[PDB]
Amino acid sequence: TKLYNTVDANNFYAFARVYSGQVKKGQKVKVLGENYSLEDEEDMVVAHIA
Amino acid sequence: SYNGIGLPTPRGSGTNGYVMRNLSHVKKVQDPSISEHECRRQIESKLLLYREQLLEEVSSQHSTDAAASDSNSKTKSLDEADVEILVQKYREQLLKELQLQKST
Amino acid sequence: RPIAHMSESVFKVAVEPHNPSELPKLLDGLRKTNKSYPLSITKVEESGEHTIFGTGEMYMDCLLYDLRTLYSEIEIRVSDPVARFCETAVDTSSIKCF
Amino acid sequence: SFRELVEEFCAENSLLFVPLRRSHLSTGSALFRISTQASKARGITVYLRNDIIWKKSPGASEDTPYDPIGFNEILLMFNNN
Amino acid sequence: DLLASRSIWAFGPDDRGTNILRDDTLSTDVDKNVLNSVKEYIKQGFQWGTREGPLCDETIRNVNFRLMDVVLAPEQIYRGGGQIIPTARRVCYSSFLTA
């Protein structure tokens, strides 16, 4: 729900609440946008977790 | 230097700045009645659905009466005779609209 | 579900770079700003100028401070603030429209 | 304008012009989705800039650039399936 | 009233919007399947029209677009959603301006 500035304004930290499962660094996750649905599947973006 | 009035610095001019206020500034129906007719026919349709609800209530009363007779499910009172009395009400409202047009 | 905020933006300010040679950094700056402020609504008009929507004047002040200093260290020309309008109808349609 | 041009062109070819309520992260333009029919697995995502329709390869990241597409390319890819 | 209360199609623009898409097609319409076919993409046209106002490029508030009459004779082949959305947007604009 939030993005936070690093000490230098270069990258953002995503503030997330893990509702289920487990997460490890380097994991492959799929990011869903605000209007991702069965109609709009193009809001998906594959990303790693640094 | 204040509200767009004044010079940036008094140095360089023969003055001291000191801007003053001017002290003399002058501060000074609907044409296509077809819409109403369509609304009238639509409220007639709302009354039609209301009487269909009343007919459904009468059908429930008939089902209860038939169940009581059996003692001595859900059924329908009138499948199609309601359409004839509906056409009668259509004639009635057409007479109403004719009378209203004559009155105007 | 997307967040249901407690207020709308209804406070518009138009910005542009001081010199158009540094237009791309402002665009990246606006992107970063849009990331960091949830009710900020960065929009681009037909004229090419960029508008920003914020909750109030303090909101826009902090937003423009971050835009100038934090994200895109350039200098920008900020227009006077203006409200966000809406249109409505007060009387029934005069004629049928097809 | 060109927007009405593409609108009536999609109207002629019996397609569906759906506005995706999104804006491009880099250019800020509105994104649109054109579907051939109720079959939604095949759908073209396109944005409009300087009177040329811009397309993205399926499965590509956002930072990847947008390649051009034409009316005849759209019809060729929509008539063979 | 009853039929008007049952005829609420959608809110525009999007959910939580302050516009109501209503339809008063006089009933007596055999083409109910046709009407329900064209409704699913007249909804999108109504949302598009009420999101981007004709008076200025802005949202519309506190207005119901009660549909009056729709006429379409041929079969479903000629009913293209993209062919009819601009018509819905334009008629919404024109009705709003006349109001």
Phi-psi region at D40: left, alpha or beta (left = phi > 0; alpha = psi -120 to 50): alpha
Angstrom resolution of this structure: 3.2
Burial class (CB in 10 A: 0-12, 13-18, 19+), A24: exposed
- B36 touches B30 (CB < 8 A): yes
> Is residue D18 within 8 angstroms of chain E, CB to CB?
yes
Task: Look at residues B75, B47, D69, D3 and name the one whose alpha carbon lies nearest to residue E2.
Answer: B47
Q: List chain E gaps (C–N > 2.5 A) by preceding residue.
A: none
Taking the CA atoms of chain D, what radius of gyration do you get in angstroms?
Answer: 12
Q: How far lies C48's CA from each of B71, C18, D23, D56, E66, in Å?
A: 82, 14, 15, 24, 37
- How far apart CA D60 and CA D75 sit, in angstroms, is 22
* Touch between chain B and chain C: 3 or more Cβ pairs under 8 Å: yes
Q: How far lies E89's CA from each of C24, E56, E82, E84, in Å?
A: 35, 14, 11, 9
* Angle, helix E32-51 to helix E81-98, in steps of 10 degrees: 60
Residue with tokens 């109030």: C56
HSE value, Cβ hemisphere, 13 Å, CA-based, for B104: 5
B86 token code pair: 């509906």
Q: Do D14 and E80 touch (CB under 8 A)?
A: yes
* Sequence-separated (6 or more) residues with CB below 8 Å from residue D64: D56, D57
Residue with tokens 């089902």: B63
**CB contacts, 8 Å: C10 with chain E:** none
* Touch between chain C and chain D: 3 or more Cβ pairs under 8 Å: yes
- How far apart CA D69 and CA D74 sit, in angstroms, is 7
**CB contacts, 8 Å: A9 with chain C:** 32, 70-71
Residues 24-43 of C with CB under 8 A from D: 27, 31, 42-43
Q: Do C32 and A1 touch (CB under 8 A)?
A: no
Closest approach of D50 to chain A, Cα-based (Å): 24
By DSSP bridging, strand C76-78 and strand C41-44 are unpaired
Neighbours of C33 (CB within 10 A): 21
C–E interface: beta-carbon pairs under 8 A: 40
Tell me the sheet residues that pair with B73.
none
Residue A13 phi, psi (nearest 5)? -105, 130
Q: Do A42 and D20 touch (CB under 8 A)?
A: yes
- D29 touches D66 (CB < 8 A): no
Q: Do B30 and C94 touch (CB under 8 A)?
A: yes
Q: Do D20 and A45 touch (CB under 8 A)?
A: no
HSE value, Cβ hemisphere, 13 Å, CA-based, for C33: 31
Q: How far lies B61's CA from each of B25, B86, C83, in Å?
A: 86, 20, 61
- How far apart CA A7 and CA A16 sit, in angstroms, is 19
Tell me the sheet residues that pair with D32.
D19, D46
Tell me the sheet residues that pair with E98.
none
Taken in order D66, D70, D71, D75, the sign of the CA dihedral is negative
| Technique of determination | cryo-EM
- C56 touches C11 (CB < 8 A): yes
Closest approach of C49 to chain A, Cα-based (Å): 25
Q: How far lies C90's CA from each of B87, C93, D61, E53, E62, in Å?
A: 39, 9, 47, 15, 9
- C44 touches C50 (CB < 8 A): yes
User: Could you tell me which chains touch chain B, where touching means 3 or more CB pairs under 8 A?
Assistant: C, E
Q: Do D16 and E81 touch (CB under 8 A)?
A: yes
DSSP C87: B
Taking every pair of C-alpha atoms in chain E, what is the biggest distance, in angstroms?
Answer: 39
Say whether D63 sits in a helix, a strand or coil: coil
E13: preceding bond cis by omega (within 30 degrees): yes
* Sequence-separated (6 or more) residues with CB below 8 Å from residue B70: none
Say whether B87 sits in a helix, a strand or coil: helix
Taking every pair of C-alpha atoms in chain A, what is the biggest distance, in angstroms?
Answer: 39
HSE value, Cβ hemisphere, 13 Å, CA-based, for B13: 9
Neighbours of D60 (CB within 10 A): 11
- How far apart CA D66 and CA B100 sit, in angstroms, is 67
D75 token code pair: 């019809």
- How far apart CA B74 and CA B66 sit, in angstroms, is 10
Taken in order C92, C97, D2, D5, the sign of the CA dihedral is positive
Helix segments in chain E, DSSP class H: 2-6, 32-51, 81-98
Helix segments in C1-98, DSSP class H: 23-36, 57-65
Residue with tokens 């849009």: C34
- D34 touches D10 (CB < 8 A): yes
Say whether C54 sits in a helix, a strand or coil: coil
Closest approach of A45 to chain D, Cα-based (Å): 7
A–D interface: beta-carbon pairs under 8 A: 14
User: Could you tell me which chains touch chain C, where touching means 3 or more CB pairs under 8 A?
Assistant: A, B, D, E
Q: Kindly report the CA angle at C15 between C13 and C18, in degrees rounded to 5?
A: 155
- B45 touches B86 (CB < 8 A): no
